[PDB]
Design a protein around this nucleic acid. Sequence first.
RNA 1: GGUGAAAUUCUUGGAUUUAUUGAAGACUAACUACUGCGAAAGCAUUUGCCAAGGACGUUUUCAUUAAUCAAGAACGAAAGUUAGGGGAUCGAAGAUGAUCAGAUACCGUCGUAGUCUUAACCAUAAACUAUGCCGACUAGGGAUCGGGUGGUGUUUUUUUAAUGACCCACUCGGCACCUUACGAGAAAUCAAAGUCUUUGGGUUCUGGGGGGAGUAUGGUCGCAAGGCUGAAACUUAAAGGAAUU
Lengths: 25, 226, 96, 200, 150, 94, 91, 127
Amino acid sequence: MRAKWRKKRTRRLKRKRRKVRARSK
Amino acid sequence: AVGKNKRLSKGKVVDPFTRKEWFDIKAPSTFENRNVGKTLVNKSTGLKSASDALKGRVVEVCLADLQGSEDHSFRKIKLRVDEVQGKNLLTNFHGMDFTTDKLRSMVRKWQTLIEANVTVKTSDDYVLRIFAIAFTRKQANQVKRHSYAQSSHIRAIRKVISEILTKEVQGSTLAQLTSKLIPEVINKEIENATKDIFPLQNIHVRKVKLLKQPKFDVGALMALHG
Amino acid sequence: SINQKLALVIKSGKYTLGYKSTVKSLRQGKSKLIIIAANTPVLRKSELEYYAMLSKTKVYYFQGGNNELGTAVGKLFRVGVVSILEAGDSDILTTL
Amino acid sequence: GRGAPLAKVVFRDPYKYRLREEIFIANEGVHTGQFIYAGKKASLNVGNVLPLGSVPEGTIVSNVEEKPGDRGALARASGNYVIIIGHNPDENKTRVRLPSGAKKVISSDARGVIGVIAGGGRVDKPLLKAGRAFHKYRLKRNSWPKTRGVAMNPVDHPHGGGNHQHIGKASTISRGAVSGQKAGLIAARRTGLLRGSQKT
Amino acid sequence: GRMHSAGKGISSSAIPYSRNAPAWFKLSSESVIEQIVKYARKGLTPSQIGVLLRDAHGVTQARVITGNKIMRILKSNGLAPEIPEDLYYLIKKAVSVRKHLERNRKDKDAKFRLILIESRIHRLARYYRTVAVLPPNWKYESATASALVN
Amino acid sequence: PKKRASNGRNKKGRGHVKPVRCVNCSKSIPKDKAIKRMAIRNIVEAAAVRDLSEASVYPEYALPKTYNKLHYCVSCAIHARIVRVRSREDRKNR
Amino acid sequence: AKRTKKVGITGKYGVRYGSSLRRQVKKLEIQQHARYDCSFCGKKTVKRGAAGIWTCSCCKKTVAGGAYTVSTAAAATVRSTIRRLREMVEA
Amino acid sequence: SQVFGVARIYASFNDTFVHVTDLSGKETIARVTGGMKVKADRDESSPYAAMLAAQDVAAKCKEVGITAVHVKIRATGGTRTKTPGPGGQAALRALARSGLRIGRIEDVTPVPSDSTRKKGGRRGRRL
RNA sequence: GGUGAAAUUCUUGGAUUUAUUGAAGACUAACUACUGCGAAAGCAUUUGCCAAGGACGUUUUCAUUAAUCAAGAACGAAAGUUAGGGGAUCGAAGAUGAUCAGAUACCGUCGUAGUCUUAACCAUAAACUAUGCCGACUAGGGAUCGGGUGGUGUUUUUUUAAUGACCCACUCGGCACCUUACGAGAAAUCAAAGUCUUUGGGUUCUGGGGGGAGUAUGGUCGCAAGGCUGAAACUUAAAGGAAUU
């Protein structure tokens, strides 16, 4: 993958993890 | 695409040049050979007439044709029709424009383009925006092939160019200004006044376009076309 | 500059500050030049010009306010008009 | 009841020995004790009331009269002004851009106050609590609080009624509708969010 | 060099080797000393006194003509300014940018220059306080800076 | 590895210039980086002046020439054969 | 002693009305309650009265201006344009 | 002794325009173009179609009364091409060789003083 | 109208085109360069105002006040955010036209946010000269920018004074460039990337095989998007750099 696309993928995945985080904490 | 149009008329013969009459144009007395040309116009009817539809018109011609000589070919004079006299439309000075061939010819690289403009009102209340151009030149015995300026001589010559144009326009009429641009005496005045700052070359005035027209004054027109 | 000239006068010559003191100096004729800020009341300025014309003195206008005039003089407070009792070691009287 | 401060300018009666007091809407930069020169041959100064027929183009004016002898028609709200666009010498008429953005053509003998109406930027702070809105509307009229028609009974409002809270019919109401059916958007040419230029 | 810029140009004065000079000078030491204080009495800073005495009089430098320097002579005869001249002009320049930045706030270039000037003033003030020229508690106050320049 | 001392094209001491647009494919390129070719060609095609001269009012003497400056992107300049690749030794040639 | 670190003046509203609205009303109220100076006297004594009215306590001269600012930027630009037009026409 | 006109030969890609005009500019004579002579929609701007189009513009003008015209050959201009079309120079030869004398050729293509933006994006017309 | 070719779309309601204007916003061609300025980002119409800066000239003054920097602070492209103004072209999304086995990609026509500006945030880039800052020395050559010096030098106004613009020589600071390789480097290459096994001028920051990973968690800044600091478990014997055929 390109660096931009890999970083975008992990950023979206981080957004999803933080959205899941906000439900419990 | 003669056979590709599908919808030609969404709503659902006589040749139009039989109702058109030739009209011969004339030019100010500033230009020697008046002899402008001829133009079409719809025949004079009771609804719109021909004078009203021909009253507003600006015809563009070349100064070389007007003056007969050939050293004015790069300058084209724009004449505006404003009044008729029974099959001879009469014009007046409307502007001057340097042809694209000449303007892009003097514009070369490895030289400095000096430009300026002035908004000045004449004696006859003709608010005019006059443009001027100037290019730096390689003086004789010079070996450096750039011939650039230091941006301070440019401002100085720009100030001198502006005041020269202001002086020769404020204190004269439109007819006098037209009779002044043709001999190109303004270029001589500039090259006399800005020769102590930088040599320069191709001193010219670009456009004398009109901005505001005063009261119609059909009296001045009759003096123009004697 | 005018600010440097005023500072030199304040340092060397005799100066007085305020409006009543300026009027007193004009009355006694011990004044030569008066500098009035562009922020003083127009009535006060006009009366100052009347006194100056009666006493045959010079009038100068400071293109600022009372704060700027006080800063140029060298004081923290607000000065509306300064009367120059003695030039001292400066030249503000002879020039400008 | 008005967000624009008022200025009490008093004049001298030219025909009788008596002081006339006039109420003018205060403009930005106008202070007490200021001399206001109202008339035709005045100067282009803030607060002056020169007619629009003797001012240069691009002039910012206020309290513009629709017709001569109106004593204030347009630009009477805080922070609003009228822009002069041009003048016609023959058949004297001045062209004006109004605060709404609608082109207008008025007579050249319409007097207007030079400047910008004071109190500009008044609607830039949320009323925050209902008390501020109540106090603001009490000094104006009985138009607060306002009850939604969709929460009403079918007899008290056309949009009311039903087991749910829905309009039922289209909110857009034609211009040629009699009194009673005009509850919603009146002659709405377009609806929805205004995205892009308004093509004014 | 150029403490607060990227320049590296070298340009200064090259004094002559002759510590006893300029030979052709004929005026006395006392004559130039009373000229120094006369110029100092009319508000001229030591730099301008040397400049005026160098181009108008025959005084090449006031160190070989006299026994001391211009600032040294001013202090001895009682015409020494309270604050150093170089610091005085630096503070004068600083309040000029602050005056410029109080009306045209959107000038970020002036803000960067103002920080550079203020940093330069503080560095110079530290040396003067250390060398026991200014009061030990002397500080550069922005509000009081305009009053300090008088 | 590094190919040219001037990395993109003709830019040492500026850092940034206003970009220009290619005339062929509308590609945004820096003004220095763009390859410029000046067109001095006459308003008429090759030959055909003699046909114009016979049907020319006034003693000719017009012969206008159109002047235009064209900016080409790297992809378009190579594709249009205006700019061609060279050997390493020929690369240094100006 | 920095009783409030970010809330500032609008600590009266508490936790109500929303952070964004509190920030906007703080930004406008700071200028509304700020103290200005007379242009006719120079002393920092101009204070807001009613909406659009700015009256003082030393010089007592009252100025009409913005709702929360003694001089609107739009008003200043309009005044500059008016002065330029007057200078052009009266020359 | 010779009435004059203006050619206004608009030369671009996919189309070509020859529109004879009187000296003033209001009158319009023989606005025939190169797209109503070809049946391919790809040779509309081709030199072979401009000659056919200009063959009729020089006959209608002659029938009307116009014997000579001026020439102002132009391009699309704006911020798109700034270069003359493939068939613009062929159209000039067609009416010149049809007995219609010409003179004072001018280039009136609109050159912009850095106005608006050019379609294609920052990465170009990738094809 | 457009494309390699077509189509969507606009056209008896006159499209496209031409001529006379008007309004709106954006932008600063050609002149434009191995050219200038700025700490960097960056900055190209004219005029006026405001303050600032480098270089040069100096027989003016202070006098070692200096150089590099944890912490800390200012500025910081584009994009993005908040609330107004503005909103013409281009145009993340989206709607269609195609091409294609499939094409919500490349191509065509529309088009919202955005592109402009005001006030407040965001602190990122291939933000690169992939080369930190200060100082000293070392092979030559030419051109060029700014200032200065000299030459009855040339030209210029009143032929001839000045000044200005050019020629030659010199000097200081620059953006840089051409040829060589003492010297360095793995090589590509370098007037430094040289004066490093003959190892030492002063100072700051960063890296210790490739993935996991700039991820998880804990702090911290931010309205958010995101920024700063920042692992471990586990897995692998290879990745990676310059050149040769």
